[PDB]
Amino acid sequence: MTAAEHGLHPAEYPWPQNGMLSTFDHASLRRGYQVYKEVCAACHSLDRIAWRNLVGVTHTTDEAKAFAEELEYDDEPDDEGNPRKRPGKLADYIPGPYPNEQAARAANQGALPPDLSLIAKARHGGADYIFALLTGYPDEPPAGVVLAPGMNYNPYFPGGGIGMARTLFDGVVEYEDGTPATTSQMAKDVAAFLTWAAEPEHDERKKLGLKAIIVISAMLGLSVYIKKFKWSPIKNRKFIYNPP
Amino acid sequence: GKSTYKIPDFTPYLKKDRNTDANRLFSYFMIGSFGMLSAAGAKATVQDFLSNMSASADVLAMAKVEVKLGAIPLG
Amino acid sequence: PDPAIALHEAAAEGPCHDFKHHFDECVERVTKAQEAEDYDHAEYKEDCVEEFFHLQHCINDNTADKLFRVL
Amino acid sequence: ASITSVVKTSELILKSPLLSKIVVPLAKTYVKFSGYRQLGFKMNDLIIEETPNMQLALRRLPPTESYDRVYRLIRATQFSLSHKLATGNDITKPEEDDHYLIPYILDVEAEAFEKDALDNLEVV
Amino acid sequence: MALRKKNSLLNMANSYVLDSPQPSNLNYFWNFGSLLALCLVIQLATGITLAMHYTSHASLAFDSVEHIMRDVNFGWFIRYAHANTASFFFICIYAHMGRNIYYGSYKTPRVLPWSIGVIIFLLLIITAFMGYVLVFGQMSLWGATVICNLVSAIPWLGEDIVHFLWGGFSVGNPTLQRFFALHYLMPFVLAVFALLHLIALHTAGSSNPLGITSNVDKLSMHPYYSFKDLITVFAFLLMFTLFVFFSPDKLGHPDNYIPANPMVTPASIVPEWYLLPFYAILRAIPDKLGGVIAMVAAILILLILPIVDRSIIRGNAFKPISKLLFGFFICNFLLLGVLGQVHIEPPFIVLGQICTIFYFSYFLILLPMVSTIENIFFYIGSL
Amino acid sequence: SHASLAFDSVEHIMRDVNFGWFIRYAHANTASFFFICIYAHMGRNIYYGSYKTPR
Amino acid sequence: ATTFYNVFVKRNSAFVATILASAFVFDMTFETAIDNFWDRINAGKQWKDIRHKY
Amino acid sequence: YMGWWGHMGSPPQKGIAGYTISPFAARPFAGVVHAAIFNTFRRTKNQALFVILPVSFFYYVWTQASEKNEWLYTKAGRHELAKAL
Ligand code: HEC
Ligand code: HEM
Ligand code: HEM
Ligand SMILES: CCCCCCCCCCCCO[C@@H]1O[C@H](CO)[C@@H](O[C@H]2O[C@H](CO)[C@@H](O)[C@H](O)[C@H]2O)[C@H](O)[C@H]1O
Ligand SMILES: CCCCCCCCCCCCO[C@@H]1O[C@H](CO)[C@@H](O[C@H]2O[C@H](CO)[C@@H](O)[C@H](O)[C@H]2O)[C@H](O)[C@H]1O
């Protein structure tokens, strides 16, 4: 296939979480949540994440309950069997912008914005792809590219024409921690956040792996000593042959 | 090459202190360390693996309903 | 201002200058070809995507580490 | 394949002057690269023995030859497990690589093959 | 008499794992058998655990796998362990088969363990293929669609058989529920055949790297091979740890994290890496039925090695030409694997055809020729 | 196996699957026959002393 | 050395008891040691490091 | 073809004396450094060709094929690709 049909492959950026011993930067995760909430959540859902998932990762229990309680969710029917709403609880999932696919596509010139809960695992490239894509809309499409109507040129997207327009511009978000909200900063933060959303066990997994590496390495070293020890009578055996 | 009472040369491999308690103790320290890490590893493996059977996070999120009492009037 | 803007410009003028020139030459040719009549009724319409990819791939290799260092 | 087959075909090659001129030097090199002599084996020690015919041929070896074969197998197995090669007198010299077993297996197989032929005889 | 020998039940364990007489010179490639036993145990443990959390309904399957990853305590570990061990199972099985071909383990008197082994290998492929479908992501669906439409090539009844296996007119809920039941069951069948090939082997015992009898010099299976098996177990668990904890998705395909969508077709339907050589063989034949037959024949042709190997000597340790030919065979099998995942484009189309011819010609031409000639060289060369 | 769908899946077996009724009733009734046979087999063993040495 | 052997090693009941008690201690201390190390190499990154702002 | 301890199916053995020493009397890692260096070198040198030849050949094949494929799907390779299809 042509390189165009594949998409440009994203650079390997040095993420904080790259590295056998490295966790996510949780301050970046928090900033990334704020970008999601203020920019992406207009079109994209995050259906696999519940409010409780933010607690002790990006937010305290109080902050997350505050976010949940601002929303209305469907309750069980009342005693006359009429429908009812309730305020959100920590167990609730973060609600999406659209009721169904049809409504989503109608709002996006036919294109369906995917759910972002697994997108970092569901694309080759992961965080690097998300970062490259959001930051990689050229001012002008390369001369000779014919974009279909409602498409935007982005070389990282396979085929080149993506239904999502450039959305991150300097200062679309005002970070609560005073970090300058440049396009690159926001893309880095949101890409970190989405990577966390796809793999929230990441930090724990790598710490348990460190313990496992150490124990299993020691057991490997000892197993070799014990093998050599038990085998030495066989390896050291000598013969004297006197033909009968 | 002929006499079977002339034991072949094992001097490259023989330990001088082979009959001492120190000597046996060392090898049992290796065996025991290996048994120790295997025991610690098996405990960790079992405990982590079986914890999958304990209430999952979504279940634990549904118990423990908290209710205010300030809203509720007398009677 | 976005740190990437300056780093990309620097990498285009510097280590990726040969690729910058290729892309530029390509765009000149394609624009000129589109300017000429009966371009719409041609068999093969040239783009500059290949050259663009070569340039971007180069810029990214020279910038990735530097950019993440200033965020 | 049968030892009989191998022996007959080899004899056809050794007869033809042209063929022997080109094959015998190759076969000598092959054997050198094979490296079974570096474990102190004779070629015949490598023949597959878990066959009724071969079991019978081994039972017909003279006791001395049989005892020596058992020692060569045990010695080679010990070099194998130690990842050492034979040195000195343990290396099989080309003159020591005698076909001690070939005559026995050729007799066993001669009878076995005659038996198969004669089981299919048709009185005329 | 010692209890381990007196008591019938204990005696069976004893005969297989303790007093079993082994050659004293088995090398590290004899350790894949026990690794395969370990993989089989890990897959049973993780598998049964996932089954306690998985829901086989197509409306809920993908989400149940997300629930495992997100909500179940250590669910991530159990899921990644199960998925990665399936890859390790095939690394060990290819190694174990490679060992058997190189050292002539398929020759008399071990034709029966070998032939049962070929069936174990088929069951493993089916098992792993069904398990892949259970996620019900895009690769799950598109895998089941394409692979079950190969059955359509069976003449006359093929279409009927496909609809019968799917339980409908497309891959959907009925397909998923029946693959779940069968995926649970197949590993138990596989374990029984694994046990049969060992019982068959017990009559001859293990071959050894020299290819000579070991009746002259045996060692008890325990403690010598017990302790030697521990080294490779810990080496395996180190590799397992690096994938499961540090790179759990390295061996897989991102498309399976997108829920199955019958409308949208993924960019590229490629099977899991371990199936890739057979997929390349199938692509090589232009005919649909031809391709399916070739792909099955690529596995069943292993059953004829006992016939086509005409050597008077067991295994390749002492056969320089056979060793070279085996090297080329193995590398070609890897190249087939790589061609299984390239696009159907020049020049890989013709290359795949050449590699397919080479694959078959090893069994049908080269191995019979080379083994015949080496027989003559050993005889003439040692005169 | 999901609790929201289990009971209904058993009704689907009874109502929609070809011979599903048979497979379901065979499975449920054979469980009773399994226990009739097992009690009989145990009864046989106790009456005839099958539990004595060497068994 | 003889003393150590006689007490902890000679009887397998004692040896197994010593191994298990050692496993218990190792398990507890190794947990604590890894925890602290992990916190130092990932300093300022974890929630525990930023929690104080909230 | 295999028996059991006591009747394994060996031809009669006579005349071989075997000797060995206890695991506790031996140094298990005696001469390990010599083996790790010199023995591994010998064993690897002797097997090197059987790995190098097939690997180098199939790598060359792949390299040529992948480079051609890449070139056919460039602008420069348009014509050659048209013929190849
Ligand atoms: C107002 C619309 C809109 C906003 C704002 C938006 N997106 Fe999208 N996005 C889309 C649409 C529509 C698609 C699907 C495009 C297509 O498939 O052609 C999409 C696709 C994506 C994809 C997948 C591309 C692929 O490979 O399929 C990712 C990742 C993504 N968006 C992330 C984000 C992030 C991160 C933000 C903001 C921080 C964001 N989006 C903001 C509409 C939006
Ligand atoms: C040889 C044994 C086995 C092999 C090779 C095997 C292989 C696989 C594979 C490849 C998958 C797809 C993994 C993924 O990408 O998520 C899978 C999934 C699954 N397997 Fe197995 N499996 C085995 C045994 C078992 C057994 C015994 C069970 C018992 C039920 C089981 C239950 C499951 C379940 C529930 C899933 C779906 C959940 C998931 O994808 O993780 N497996 N298996
Ligand atoms: C679940 C899969 C399998 C398991 C658990 C398994 C296990 C074993 C074990 C434990 C042995 C004895 C030890 C050894 O030599 O490594 C062995 C030997 C053997 N296996 Fe397998 N095996 C499996 C699959 C296969 C397959 C797929 C084949 C063949 C295609 C096969 C053919 C053989 C043969 C021929 C032997 C005898 C080899 C010899 O000792 O010379 N096995 N297997
Ligand atoms: C055949 C065996 C029969 C009997 C064995 C019974 C064992 C079953 C016990 C399940 C016990 C789990 O108990 C719980 O374990 C988890 C790890 O799993 C521990 O959890 C701790 O380490 C894990 C990682 O290992 C972290 O994710 C967690 O943040 C931390 O608190 C808890 O501190 C403990 O409360
Ligand atoms: C590897 C998994 C571990 C479980 C073991 C496998 C379970 C099924 C094995 C039983 C199948 C029958 O296995 C058969 O049993 C008997 C006794 O046990 C063995 O008999 C062997 O050992 C006994 C004493 O140890 C001798 O009397 C006999 O001369 C010898 O051949 C056979 O060699 C074996 O083929």
Short mmCIF file of N, CA and C in Angstrom, two decimals, chain E residues 21 60 64 81 87 126 144-146 157 163 193 195 204 221 225 241 262 270 285 309 320 323-325 329 342 345:
data_model
loop_
_atom_site.label_atom_id
_atom_site.label_comp_id
_atom_site.label_asym_id
_atom_site.label_seq_id
_atom_site.Cartn_x
_atom_site.Cartn_y
_atom_site.Cartn_z
N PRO E 21 12.79 -44.36 33.85
CA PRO E 21 14.18 -44.32 33.40
C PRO E 21 14.40 -43.45 32.18
N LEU E 60 -22.86 -8.71 25.51
CA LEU E 60 -22.22 -8.47 26.79
C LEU E 60 -20.79 -8.99 26.83
N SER E 64 -17.80 -7.81 29.08
CA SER E 64 -17.42 -8.62 30.22
C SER E 64 -15.91 -8.70 30.28
N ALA E 81 -2.27 -12.88 31.42
CA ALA E 81 -1.64 -14.18 31.54
C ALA E 81 -2.25 -15.15 30.55
N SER E 87 0.38 -17.46 23.44
CA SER E 87 1.50 -17.31 22.52
C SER E 87 2.67 -18.18 22.96
N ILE E 126 -7.33 -25.21 16.94
CA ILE E 126 -8.75 -24.99 17.07
C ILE E 126 -9.05 -24.32 18.41
N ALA E 144 -13.62 -15.10 12.80
CA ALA E 144 -14.62 -16.16 12.69
C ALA E 144 -15.28 -16.13 11.31
N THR E 145 -15.53 -14.94 10.75
CA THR E 145 -16.21 -14.87 9.46
C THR E 145 -15.36 -15.53 8.39
N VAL E 146 -14.09 -15.17 8.35
CA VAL E 146 -13.32 -15.58 7.19
C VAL E 146 -12.95 -17.04 7.35
N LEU E 157 -21.94 -29.55 0.31
CA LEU E 157 -22.51 -29.35 1.63
C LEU E 157 -21.86 -28.21 2.41
N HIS E 163 -23.40 -22.63 7.97
CA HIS E 163 -24.55 -22.10 8.67
C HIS E 163 -24.85 -22.92 9.92
N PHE E 193 -5.35 -36.08 25.03
CA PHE E 193 -4.43 -36.53 24.00
C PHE E 193 -2.98 -36.35 24.41
N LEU E 195 -1.92 -36.78 27.31
CA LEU E 195 -1.63 -37.93 28.14
C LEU E 195 -1.49 -39.20 27.29
N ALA E 204 8.75 -47.06 24.46
CA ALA E 204 10.10 -46.94 23.92
C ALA E 204 10.99 -46.11 24.84
N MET E 221 13.99 -40.11 36.38
CA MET E 221 13.42 -38.82 36.03
C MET E 221 13.57 -37.84 37.20
N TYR E 225 15.91 -34.83 36.28
CA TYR E 225 15.22 -34.01 35.32
C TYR E 225 14.21 -33.09 36.00
N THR E 241 6.84 -12.98 32.72
CA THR E 241 6.82 -11.75 33.49
C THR E 241 7.08 -10.53 32.61
N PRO E 262 -20.25 -5.69 12.40
CA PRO E 262 -20.41 -6.43 11.15
C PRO E 262 -20.31 -5.60 9.87
N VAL E 270 -5.49 -10.26 9.72
CA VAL E 270 -4.41 -11.22 9.84
C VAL E 270 -4.62 -12.02 11.11
N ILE E 285 -2.10 -20.79 -2.88
CA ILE E 285 -2.89 -21.49 -3.87
C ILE E 285 -4.04 -20.58 -4.29
N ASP E 309 11.58 -40.20 5.64
CA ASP E 309 12.95 -40.22 6.16
C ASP E 309 13.53 -41.63 6.00
N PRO E 320 25.59 -33.78 8.51
CA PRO E 320 25.79 -32.38 8.14
C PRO E 320 24.84 -31.88 7.05
N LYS E 323 21.39 -31.43 8.47
CA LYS E 323 21.34 -30.27 9.35
C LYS E 323 21.15 -29.00 8.54
N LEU E 324 21.81 -28.90 7.37
CA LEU E 324 21.68 -27.72 6.54
C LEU E 324 20.26 -27.62 5.99
N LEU E 325 19.76 -28.75 5.52
CA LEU E 325 18.42 -28.81 4.96
C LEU E 325 17.41 -28.43 6.04
N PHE E 329 14.69 -25.42 6.07
CA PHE E 329 13.29 -25.71 6.29
C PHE E 329 12.73 -24.79 7.38
N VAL E 342 2.04 -9.81 5.39
CA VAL E 342 2.24 -8.72 4.44
C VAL E 342 0.96 -8.57 3.63
N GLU E 345 0.41 -8.29 -2.36
CA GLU E 345 0.96 -7.36 -3.33
C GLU E 345 2.24 -7.94 -3.91
#
